[PDB]
């Protein structure tokens, strides 16, 4: 029932609101924080070293109303680097709580 065009429009607005935050949000307490970023799926804020960072499931998802308590996660290492998957230069991410159904 949810169309591609409606989802694309919602995603563009999510990206725009995210870009506003990336530019406007105050600087991190220290350089040891992992840097905020938009990874095409979710908008990530700066991360405290050695901690998990969570954001709600992206609101543009067609099934967003079905995962309102969900969160997507990343891990900011003690050295201030987003944990990376051994597979590549991509960050480890846990999106399981935002999957359909």
């Amino acid at each position: 029932t949810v169309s591609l065009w409606e989802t694309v429009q919602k995603w563009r607005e999510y990206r725009r609101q995210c870009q506003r935050s990336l530019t406007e949000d105050p600087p991190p307490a220290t350089d040891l924080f992992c840097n905020r970023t938009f990874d095409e799926y979710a908008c990530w804020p700066d991360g405290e070293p050695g901690s998990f960072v969570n954001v709600s499931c992206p609101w543009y998802l067609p099934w967003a109303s079905s995962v309102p308590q969900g969160h997507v996660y990343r891990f900011c290492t003690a050295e201030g680097l987003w944990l990376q998957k051994d597979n590549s230069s991509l960050p480890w991410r846990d999106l399981s709580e935002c999957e359909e159904s």
């Binding site: 029932t1 949810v2 169309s3 591609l4 409606e6 989802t7 694309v8 995603w11 095409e40 799926y41 998802l61 067609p62 999106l95 359909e100």
Partner: peptide
């Protein structure tokens, strides 16, 4: 899930889902 409109609706719903899968993996 037995009528032509069930398949058509399913097909239409897949475009949005493929878009998401593309954002996730890419």
């Amino acid at each position: 899930g037995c009528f032509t409109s069930d398949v058509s609706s399913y097909l239409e719903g897949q475009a949005a889902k493929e878009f998401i899968a593309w954002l996730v993996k890419g």
